[PDB]
Amino acid sequence: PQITLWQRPIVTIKIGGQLKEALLNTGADDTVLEEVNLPGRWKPKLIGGIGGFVKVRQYDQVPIEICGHKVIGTVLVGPTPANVIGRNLMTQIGCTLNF
């Protein structure tokens, strides 16, 4: 798909038998999602930093679908002003900037 940038590039993602909305953010290195009960082991992770850090949980090799593209990737789970799909998953789905 080709997504123009007149509007915020919000897409539907499928994460664990659950459909959500997330913004494709090339300004973000990682993918952060509002609390969801992903199964299994996870590692603590600090994100953000300016003014202090926020702790989230790092889930690895998570299966997730982005506009019908099934990918495996690291998902950070915790508080966030919105769901954000970062560069880590955009390379998995082969997403690039073109002009």
Q: Which of residues 42-61 bind ligand GLC (CB under 6 A)?
A: none
**Pick 1 or 51: Cβ nearer ligand GLC:** 51
Q: CB of 77 within 8 A of CB of 38? A: yes
Quick one: which of 18, 39, 51, 61 contacts a second copy (CB under 8 A)?
51
Q: What distance in Å separates the CA atoms of residue 81 and residue 4, rounded to the nearest whole number?
A: 23
Q: How far is the CB of 99 from a second copy (least distance, A)?
A: 4
**Spatial CB neighbours of 67, under 8 Å, sequence gap ≥ 6:** 1, 11, 12, 93
Q: Which of residues 3-22 bind a second copy (CB under 8 A)?
A: 3-6, 8-9
Q: What distance in Å separates the CA atoms of residue 79 and residue 37, rounded to the nearest whole number?
A: 13
Q: What distance in Å separates the CA atoms of residue 59 and residue 25, rounded to the nearest whole number?
A: 19
- Asked if 25 is part of the footprint of a second copy (rule: CB under 8 A), the reply reads yes
Q: Which of residues 67-96 bind ligand GLC (CB under 6 A)?
A: 78-80
Question: What is the binding site for ligand GLC (CB under 6 A)?
Answer: 34-35, 78-80
